[PDB]
Amino acid sequence: LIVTQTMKGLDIQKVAGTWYSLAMAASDISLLDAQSAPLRVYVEELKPTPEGDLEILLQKWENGECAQKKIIAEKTKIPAVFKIDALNENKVLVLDTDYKKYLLFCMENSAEPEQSLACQCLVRTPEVDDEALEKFDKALKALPMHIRLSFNPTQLEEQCHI
Ligand SMILES: [Cl-]
């Protein structure tokens, strides 16, 4: 937990459904450069199981394909942290989400937080919400982010964002 901010009272059942990864920032340029970057992933939908786990359907550039992956985020004791498995075990921290418009989340790594941590600004619609990106930038002023990608509405609608 290098990330100091976290959602209190998260109703994971309420973040269910579809999302666009409007912004992404990483603590390392190398995590977000080419589309093949290891953290250049595009959320599509968030499926919370009844048991409380969180399915994430994301797009991701695999080879020359915009490949669609599905990652399962297991619940933890903290309602706002989830545990994707398991090259190393990565936490998925939810920082802020009004459920209806935006959702700020970060994945870090337990074994190396500062050298690999990506955060993202999800939004419900394919618009450019400045109130959302501002909150995103507020949350990141305190983090060691070295790359900051931002997409345009027409990019949001294509797969893997172009
Ligand atoms: Cl147009």
UniProtKB/Swiss-Prot annotation:
Name of a matching Pfam family: Lipocalin
Single GO MF annotation: retinol binding
Domain of life: Eukaryota
PTM field: Alternate disulfide bonds occur in equal amounts in all variants examined.
Predominant subcellular localization, coarse grouping: secreted
Location relative to the cell: Secreted
GO cellular component, one term: extracellular region
UniProt keywords, alphabetically: Allergen, Disulfide bond, Milk protein, Retinol-binding, Secreted, Signal, Transport
Disulfide bonds listed in the record: 66-160, 106-119, 106-121
CDD domains linked: lipocalin_beta-LG-like (cd19416)
Expression (tissue specificity): Synthesized in mammary gland and secreted in milk.
Effect of residue 59 to H: In variant C; found only in the Jersey breed
Residue runs in coiled coils: none
General function of this protein: Primary component of whey, it binds retinol and is probably involved in the transport of that molecule.
Record text on subunit structure and interactions: Under physiological conditions beta-lactoglobulin exists as an equilibrium mixture of monomeric and dimeric forms. Interaction with LMBR1L which mediates the endocytosis of LGB has been observed in PubMed:17991420, but not in PubMed:23964685.
UniProt family annotation: Belongs to the calycin superfamily. Lipocalin family.
The protein's name: Beta-lactoglobulin
Organism: Bos taurus
Gene: LGB
